[PDB]
Design an enzyme around this catalytic site. Structure first.
Site, short mmCIF file in Angstrom:
data_model
loop_
_atom_site.label_atom_id
_atom_site.label_comp_id
_atom_site.label_asym_id
_atom_site.label_seq_id
_atom_site.Cartn_x
_atom_site.Cartn_y
_atom_site.Cartn_z
N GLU A 105 10.66 -5.50 2.61
CA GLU A 105 10.66 -5.52 1.15
C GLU A 105 9.45 -4.78 0.60
OE1 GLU A 105 11.60 -9.27 -0.96
OE2 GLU A 105 9.80 -8.86 -2.15
N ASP B 70 -1.09 3.43 -9.24
CA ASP B 70 -0.85 2.32 -10.15
C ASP B 70 -2.08 1.97 -10.98
OD1 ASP B 70 1.65 2.26 -9.07
OD2 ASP B 70 1.50 0.24 -8.20
N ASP C 48 -5.76 -2.11 -8.44
CA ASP C 48 -4.45 -2.46 -7.91
C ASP C 48 -4.54 -2.42 -6.39
OD1 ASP C 48 -1.68 -3.12 -8.43
OD2 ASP C 48 -1.19 -1.22 -7.46
N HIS D 104 5.41 3.02 -5.44
CA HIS D 104 4.15 2.56 -6.00
C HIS D 104 3.00 2.85 -5.05
CE1 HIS D 104 6.51 -0.76 -8.40
NE2 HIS D 104 7.01 0.45 -8.56
N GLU E 130 -1.90 -2.68 -2.59
CA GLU E 130 -0.57 -2.72 -1.99
C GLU E 130 -0.81 -3.61 -0.77
OE1 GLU E 130 1.71 -1.64 -3.67
OE2 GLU E 130 0.58 -0.31 -5.00
#
Ligand SMILES: Cc1cn([C@H]2C[C@H](O)[C@@H](COP(=O)(O)O)O2)c(=O)[nH]c1=O
Ligand SMILES: Cc1cn([C@H]2C[C@H](O)[C@@H](COP(=O)(O)O)O2)c(=O)[nH]c1=O
Ligand SMILES: [Mn+2]
Ligand SMILES: [Mn+2]
Length: 174
Positions: free
Chosen positions: A55, A161, A6, A156, A8
């Site tokens: 966001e 994750d 994962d 997260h 980010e």
């Protein structure tokens, strides 16, 4: 070897290439061999040299200031490739992360081939959708479905994750 991964990022684009103009700020990957977590993982935070979109910050809470002293993608790319090479990458909505990975690899100008040419790529979200058609299949929804703990996931995190997805995927394929 199976590598549950994962990432980010600083954000994403809703039109056109989703990764254009954005950067990976965290990579989290966990190794699974013979259906067992080995404990030998890969985890890095990266300096983007651009700001994190509001966001995106709302999702991971990683502040711009925290990344100022971190390595750049170029500095971790070799070890990153040594770690994932030849494995089956398991990613929830694989196209997202793979898109960012190949984008970052391309910016290095080292003629690095596409990830799917040296790694098998499995989209755990597509797998989940096939097993549970017409149902919610976000990672959180799958955690509840398989009774996996995601209480520490208010925000997260790439490694967080990846670890949760590993447990979910092992149960989904168990
Ligand atoms: C869920 C979500 C993720 N993202 C981007 C930034 C995150 O670091 C990255 C990680 O998505 P993730 O839940 O698939 O790990 O995707 C957004 O820009 N907006 C959102 O609403
Ligand atoms: C391609 C794509 C990626 N993503 C990123 C951000 C999400 O948080 C992440 C998936 O979260 P989810 O599978 O846990 O619902 O992947 C989207 O949200 N929408 C998209 O259309
Ligand atoms: Mn993700
Ligand atoms: Mn994530």
């Amino acid at each position: 070897r199976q590598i549950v991964l994962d990432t980010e990022t600083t954000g994403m684009n809703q039109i056109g290439a989703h990764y254009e103009g954005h950067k990976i700020i965290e990579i989290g990957a966990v190794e699974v061999v013979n259906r067992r977590l080995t404990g030998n993982n890969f985890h890095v935070y990266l300096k983007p040299d651009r700001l994190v979109d509001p966001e995106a910050f709302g999702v991971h809470g990683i502040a711009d200031e925290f990344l100022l002293d971190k390595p750049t993608f170029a500095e971790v790319a070799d070890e990153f490739m040594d770690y994932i090479r030849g494995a089956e990458l398991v990613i929830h909505n694989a196209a997202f992360d793979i898109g960012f990975m190949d984008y970052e690899f391309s910016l290095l100008k080292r003629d690095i081939p596409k990830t799917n040419t040296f790694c098998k790529v499995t989209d755990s979200l597509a797998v989940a959708r096939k097993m549970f058609p017409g149902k919610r299949n976000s990672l959180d929804a799958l955690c509840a479905r398989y009774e996996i703990d995601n209480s520490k996931r208010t925000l997260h995190g790439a490694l967080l994750d990846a670890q949760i997805l590993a447990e979910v995927y092992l149960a989904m394929t168990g």
